[PDB]
Amino acid sequence: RLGCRVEGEGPTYRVTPPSHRLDLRLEEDLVEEVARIQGYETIPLALPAFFPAPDNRGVEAPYRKEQRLRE
Amino acid sequence: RLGCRVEGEGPTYRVTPPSHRLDLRLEEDLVEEVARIQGYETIPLALPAFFPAPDNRGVEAPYRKEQRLRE
DSSP states (O other), rough: OOOOOOOOOOSSSEEOTTTTTTTOHHHHHHHHHHHHSSOOOSOOOOOOOOOOGGGTTTTOOOOOOOHHHHH | OOEEEEEOOSSOOOEEEOOOOOOOSSSHHHHHHHHHSOOOOOOOOOOOOOOOOGGGGTTTTHHHHHHHHHO
16 A cells, blocks of 8 residues: 555565665565654564674773773 | 482472482472583573663662772
């Protein structure tokens, strides 16, 4: 009802956007379309929990040493 | 096979510990029994994700001000 051609059986649907929607290339362009009519005010708050990758662990060190110097 | 009387249909079972196990009062005493034979080395690592309760938010402030003073 945003005026799309939804020719799919499901789960993957294959949509063709109306001619005027240049902004709709990727599948993701499509997600903000659903979360806009729906409302960005219907995406709940949640936080991630996770074990960072090993190599990322410590990258703050050079920084803090510089911040500790200003102190 | 730790020598218990498990008289239950399930889900709640009702266990009677052998006479020598004084250390087994609560249901929880029972959980460390399962996680001991099984091995504390079979409890996986995981981290919690959560929105703290409002009133707990800020309790660090008095502290940091004192730590900032030593600095």
